[PDB]
RNA sequence: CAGCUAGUUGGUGGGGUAAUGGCCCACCAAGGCGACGACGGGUAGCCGGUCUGAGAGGAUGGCCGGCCACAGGGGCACUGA
RNA sequence: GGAGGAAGAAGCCCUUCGGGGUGUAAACUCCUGAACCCGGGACGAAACCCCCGAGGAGGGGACUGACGGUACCGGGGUAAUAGCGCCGGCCAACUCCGUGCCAGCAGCCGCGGUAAUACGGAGGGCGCGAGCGUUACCCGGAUUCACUGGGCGUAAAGGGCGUGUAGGCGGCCUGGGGCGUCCCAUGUGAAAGACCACGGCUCAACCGUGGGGGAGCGUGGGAUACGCUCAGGCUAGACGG
RNA sequence: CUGGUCCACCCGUGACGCUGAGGCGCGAAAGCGUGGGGAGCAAACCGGAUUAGAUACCCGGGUAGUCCACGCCCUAAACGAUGCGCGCUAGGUCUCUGGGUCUCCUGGGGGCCGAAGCUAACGCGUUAAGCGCGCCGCCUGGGGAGUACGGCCGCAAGGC
RNA sequence: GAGGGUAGGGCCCGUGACUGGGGCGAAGUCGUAACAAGGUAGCUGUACCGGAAGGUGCGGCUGGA
RNA sequence: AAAAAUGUAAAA
């Protein structure tokens, strides 16, 4: 039944990525688009669209990754160096506009439920809201 | 202002007097997370109209009895005895705690 | 845990009891000292440690150590209590002031005059 | 008060030549550029490098002998240099060198840094009229530093403005030599200093 | 010809039938006090020779330090398996606070302002080893998007 | 410390006060409270503040300021705004 | 007290007996001048009180100082108290004699049983200074009650296993409400304090003056993303044939 | 007579779910109670031998118990020393069982080796000790001590 | 209606012949059970028994082969 | 599958 359908999907990218996977699936979700739609705005993901899985709408999350890299073990660079989930479904994370976290000096993004929509972590101090902490990524 | 709090009968074996729960949510003082909980009010029904597991409004009001300083209001929804039982079962349980 | 079991039981406080029980934890402890022996040292030591026993003002009964080259206690001499308890001693818990009331200091004493209980002498 | 000790003794210290005196530390006798090493018996005998603490220490007692000041002031700055925002570090030398009887060494007047306090003790200096004997006393940005009246004609003052003849001195500072005063332009830029001590080190150190 | 110091040298011994050898191991940090810098620990039967094999050993290994007036660009969670710890950038005039090991790693980095603390295992070289990865880890603002970019 | 409660919970009528009120009285109805910790025991005057600490937190309430309570222990009412 | 002042007194300690150390330290020269002396000597005080007007407004006149003959100002003026802790590691500071598991130190680990940098004395050094140091208690280090920020195969720790009550948590879509929450406005959060700024007392401490936003709570308005809530639909969870 | 479990057909229900303080039930062996049974085995106990000693190791004999019924006890290295549930993350190998035009594919279960990854190491690794959410349980130096007191359960031993 | 008095219960503290175990100790006595098949694999719940550690029984676990 | 007990108390 889960939980927090964003919880187990920000772990498909993570556990997907580690593995340098092309692309991962996840049920079709309203919240999940958002979370693709500005992990993909600040640049994140390659992007995304509903896909099929036998008469189940999910969603195809096409992953980004970083250049080859020389030396021992050829590991590629990861786009999404760590990507973990703040507020849960145990403990609502509510924080207000002039509280909202600065992901590693601004290197990283705050993807959060704003009262007015999704914003970043920049994103939603310019507009001058405040919402559910939904992540971090950096 | 005068306080007024949106509660459910939960006993009616007063004369002109009526218990009222009311269940208030609040993030948890250092851990955040959305705790519920409440407390019993006696309400002054001179109409005795009000039922158990009516959902009304109570508001705070002129010093009835000793523990008495509040008064009904209007009803929200008759049939809710639902609830009535979350408080009933709550009770029979404590019967089994002791020795 | 999680964060209901926090809700609910909480993180239990710590709460440390005193190494030394001097009443109001008073910087100094007054009583008559009692019993005045030498008493064997523990593991590692041997060298004939002379304590004595202070039964205070305070209701109390314990073993205080005589630190300095000697001393001038006998079985109704008067003391004020440091507290300090000695390795080397079971039980020792509790230091005895030096220069106060019938406890005399150290004599001959130059460094660390303080401890001791020695008012400074004079060269000249 | 400051430690009357024998001073030309912790040049030795420090390994670094300290001009705590006027003439002489100038002269072919530091007391160190005789003997470069520490005093002691010992001193004479291959050392040991010290530890991080060890030289954070060594290095901030090579600053607060410096100045010759009681290291209760001496901490009582560093944190007021902390309470206030900029370039804590540098903000410290800089109100270091803010310190009137400080400035009256660095504006000619004594000839030692020790021998600015006792002048300016006795009120020898006045700040634009008053004379302030406070050895303390932090000079604002423009001030009269001048010579109190009595005290202007006084030999060993002479002495010391004679000599102060040119010689180009205090960037920050301007020196009336004709009237026997001086003045605090601006608060004296890190760069314009040049101690021998490295600042960053006395920081660490007061973070324990 | 990078400016170098060491942290630590212990001494390990052996058991074995008759006594007990030992064998000394030294950890050394290189570094010309701006973005180069790298850590080698050598291990030799002996204190001074043990050096000079950190010596090549240090001056082998090597990181980029993405400096910034002086301090680091951004704070980072680097967990070593055992030791914990965490950077972060501070301003001018704060000073190198960090650990014993740590210090002279940013000190020889060109760091000025950086506030640091060990946690969990303080193990001397665990530590060091955690700080070097740290520092390759780090990641520049350009570095970002580079990475970001893709096009 | 796990069960507690007879003015106990509520109602009608009354007394009493500046005034609401079991505050108190007579009569009537069985209610009232509790593991969201009742009842018991222990300890303690509360806050503004103070101490420490990267912060969160922890500790604390001397001085001054605000509210409270007591004036040898304990009870009472008179005078009066 | 300040400046100077020996290839460097005397004594004291060390020594490969050459010399090294105390150490510019002192002696001594010279300059200043706390203490002390003489003279002067406050602010804090203005108003109630008197007068014209109208007994007011406005305006003009008059009395009072505990501290005090104090602070402060001018002049005359003598080099004028220094102590405490530490010196094995942590931890900054090394050597000599005495002692011999004694004496005795000890905060932690430990030291002492003939050569102790660890007991005691000394020489010397390190830190601090009218203070130093001990004891006591609080926070800290302690991410060792872990929200931030722990952990549970063997190191302390999965309940012996199942059933289920409270409680906690909640799959995809659409709709109203707006409880949580988010934003604005506003009442509030008094003074003292803390912080920033300027200023007062020779500086500071102490203090005056002004500025700042503050959690939370009260009221009004706004939004609807997720939580919540009522309502409608689906089948991916669970159930059933 | 009866519980649980798996695969195929995707037919019905329509979020009905996960977890679970207290509580309720089960709970090896030994043990207790009334009654029944008793071959072998077998604490205790008797004897022989070894040994300085030998209340033991081995040998000879032997009771309760082991078995049935009904009732109580409720502990264990009750051990995977690894709580329960849902999701994502190479694969090679053999075995139990189920579906299918089948040198092979597909679902559930058991065991070894190993990608990535975690780990103090060992070692774990789609049967996780991996990555992530939800809930209960529990730990916070050793000894003292699973003791002492109190409280509850039991005929008792003793247990929580 | 203060308090006083009488009778009876609850909780807490101190004390007590004697007694139970525990901690502590440069040395004692008696054995040797444990770590190597520790010279009977060990551990363990329960039971019985013995100067003592411990042995033996019923079952169980490897942290045995 | 191997009959046979025990070494107190001062330094890295
Ligand atoms: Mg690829
Ligand atoms: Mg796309
Ligand atoms: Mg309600
Ligand atoms: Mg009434
Ligand atoms: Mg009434
Ligand atoms: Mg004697
Ligand atoms: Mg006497
Ligand atoms: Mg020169
Ligand atoms: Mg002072
Ligand atoms: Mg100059
Ligand atoms: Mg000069
Ligand atoms: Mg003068
Ligand atoms: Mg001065
Ligand atoms: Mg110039
Ligand atoms: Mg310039
Ligand atoms: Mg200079
Ligand atoms: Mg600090
Ligand atoms: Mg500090
Ligand atoms: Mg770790
Ligand atoms: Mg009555
Ligand atoms: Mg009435
Ligand atoms: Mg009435
Ligand atoms: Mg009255
Ligand atoms: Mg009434
Ligand atoms: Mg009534
Ligand atoms: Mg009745
Ligand atoms: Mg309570
Ligand atoms: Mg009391
Ligand atoms: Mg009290
Ligand atoms: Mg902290
Ligand atoms: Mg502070
Ligand atoms: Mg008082
Ligand atoms: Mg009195
Ligand atoms: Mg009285
Ligand atoms: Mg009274
Ligand atoms: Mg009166
Ligand atoms: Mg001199
Ligand atoms: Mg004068
Ligand atoms: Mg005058
Ligand atoms: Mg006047
Ligand atoms: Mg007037
Ligand atoms: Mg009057
Ligand atoms: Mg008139
Ligand atoms: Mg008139
Ligand atoms: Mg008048
Ligand atoms: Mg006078
Ligand atoms: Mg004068
Ligand atoms: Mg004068
Ligand atoms: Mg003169
Ligand atoms: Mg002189
Ligand atoms: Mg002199
Ligand atoms: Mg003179
Ligand atoms: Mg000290
Ligand atoms: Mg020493
Ligand atoms: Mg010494
Ligand atoms: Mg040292
Ligand atoms: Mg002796
Ligand atoms: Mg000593
Ligand atoms: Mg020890
Ligand atoms: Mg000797
Ligand atoms: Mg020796
Ligand atoms: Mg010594
Ligand atoms: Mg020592
Ligand atoms: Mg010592
Ligand atoms: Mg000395
Ligand atoms: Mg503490
Ligand atoms: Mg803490
Ligand atoms: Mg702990
Ligand atoms: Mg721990
Ligand atoms: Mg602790
Ligand atoms: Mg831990
Ligand atoms: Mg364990
Ligand atoms: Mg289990
Ligand atoms: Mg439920
Ligand atoms: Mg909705
Ligand atoms: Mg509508
Ligand atoms: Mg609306
Ligand atoms: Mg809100
Ligand atoms: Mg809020
Ligand atoms: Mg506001
Ligand atoms: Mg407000
Ligand atoms: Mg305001
Ligand atoms: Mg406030
Ligand atoms: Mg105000
Ligand atoms: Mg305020
Ligand atoms: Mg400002
Ligand atoms: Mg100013
Ligand atoms: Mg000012
Ligand atoms: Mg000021
Ligand atoms: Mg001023
Ligand atoms: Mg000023
Ligand atoms: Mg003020
Ligand atoms: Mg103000
Ligand atoms: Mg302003
Ligand atoms: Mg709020
Ligand atoms: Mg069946
Ligand atoms: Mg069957
Ligand atoms: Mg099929
Ligand atoms: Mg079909
Ligand atoms: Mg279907
Ligand atoms: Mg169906
Ligand atoms: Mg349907
Ligand atoms: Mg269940
Ligand atoms: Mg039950
Ligand atoms: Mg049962
Ligand atoms: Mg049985
Ligand atoms: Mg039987
Ligand atoms: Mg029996
Ligand atoms: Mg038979
Ligand atoms: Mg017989
Ligand atoms: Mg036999
Ligand atoms: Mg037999
Ligand atoms: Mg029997
Ligand atoms: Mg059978
Ligand atoms: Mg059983
Ligand atoms: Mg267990
Ligand atoms: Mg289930
Ligand atoms: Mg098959
Ligand atoms: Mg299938
Ligand atoms: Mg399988
Ligand atoms: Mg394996
Ligand atoms: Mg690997
Ligand atoms: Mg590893
Ligand atoms: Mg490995
Ligand atoms: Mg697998
Ligand atoms: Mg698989
Ligand atoms: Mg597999
Ligand atoms: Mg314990
Ligand atoms: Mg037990
Ligand atoms: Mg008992
Ligand atoms: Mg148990
Ligand atoms: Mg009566
Ligand atoms: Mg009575
Ligand atoms: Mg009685
Ligand atoms: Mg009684
Ligand atoms: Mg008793
Ligand atoms: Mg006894
Ligand atoms: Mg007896
Ligand atoms: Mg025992
Ligand atoms: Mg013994
Ligand atoms: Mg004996
Ligand atoms: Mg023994
Ligand atoms: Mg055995
Ligand atoms: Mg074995
Ligand atoms: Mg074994
Ligand atoms: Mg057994
Ligand atoms: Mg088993
Ligand atoms: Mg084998
Ligand atoms: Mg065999
Ligand atoms: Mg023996
Ligand atoms: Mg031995
Ligand atoms: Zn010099």
Known sequence: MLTDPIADMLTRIRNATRVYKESTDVPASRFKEEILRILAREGFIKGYERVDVDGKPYLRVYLKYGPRRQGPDPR??????????????????????????????????????????????????????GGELICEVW | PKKVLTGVVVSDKMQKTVTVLVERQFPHPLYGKVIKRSKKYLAHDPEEKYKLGDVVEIIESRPISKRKRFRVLRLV???????????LIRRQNYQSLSK | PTINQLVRKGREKVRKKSKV?????????????????????????????????????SGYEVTAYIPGEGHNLQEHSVVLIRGGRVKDLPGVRYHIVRGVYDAAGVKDRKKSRSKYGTKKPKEA | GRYIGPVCRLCRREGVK???????????????????????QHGQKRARRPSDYAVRLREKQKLRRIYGISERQFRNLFEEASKKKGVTGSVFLGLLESRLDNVVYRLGFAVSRRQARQLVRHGHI??????????????????????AEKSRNLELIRQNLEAMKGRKVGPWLSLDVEGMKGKFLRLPDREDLALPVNEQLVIEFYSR | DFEEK??????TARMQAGGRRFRFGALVVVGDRQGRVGLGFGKAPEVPLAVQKAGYYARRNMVEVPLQNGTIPHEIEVEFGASKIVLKPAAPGTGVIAGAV?????????????????????????????????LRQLRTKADVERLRKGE
């Open chain 1, 76 to 129: 590629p660079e990861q786009v999404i160096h760590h990507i973990r989930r703040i507020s849960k479904p145990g403990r609502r994370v509510y924080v207000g506009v002039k509280e909202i976290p600065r992901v590693r000096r601004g290197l990283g993004i705050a993807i959060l439920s704003t009262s007015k929509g999704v914003l970043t972590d920049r994103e939603a101090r310019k507009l001058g809201v």
């Open chain 2, 77 to 87: 929804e008759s049939g809710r005895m639902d609830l009535v039982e979350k408080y």
């Open chain 3, 21 to 57: 029980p001097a009443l109001k934890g008073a910087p100094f402890r007054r009583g008559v000292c009692t019993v005045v022996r030498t008493v064997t040292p523990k593991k590692p030591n041997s060298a004939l440690r002379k304590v004595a026993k202070v039964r205070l003002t």
């Open chain 4, 18 to 40: 300290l001009y705590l005196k006027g003439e002489r530390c100038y002269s072919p006798k530091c007391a160190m550029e005789r003997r470069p090493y520490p005093p002691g």
């Open chain 4, 126 to 147: 006045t700040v634009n009229g008053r004379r302030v004997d406070l050895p303390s006393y932090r000079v604002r940005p423009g001030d009269e530093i001048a010579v």
């Open chain 5, 6 to 11: 060491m942290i630590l040298i212990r001494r």
């Open chain 5, 102 to 134: 740590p210090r002279a790693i940013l000190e020889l980095a060109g760091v000025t302002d950086i506030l640091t603390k060990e946690l969990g295992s303080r193990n001397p070289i665990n530590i060091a080893y955690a700080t070097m990865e740290a």
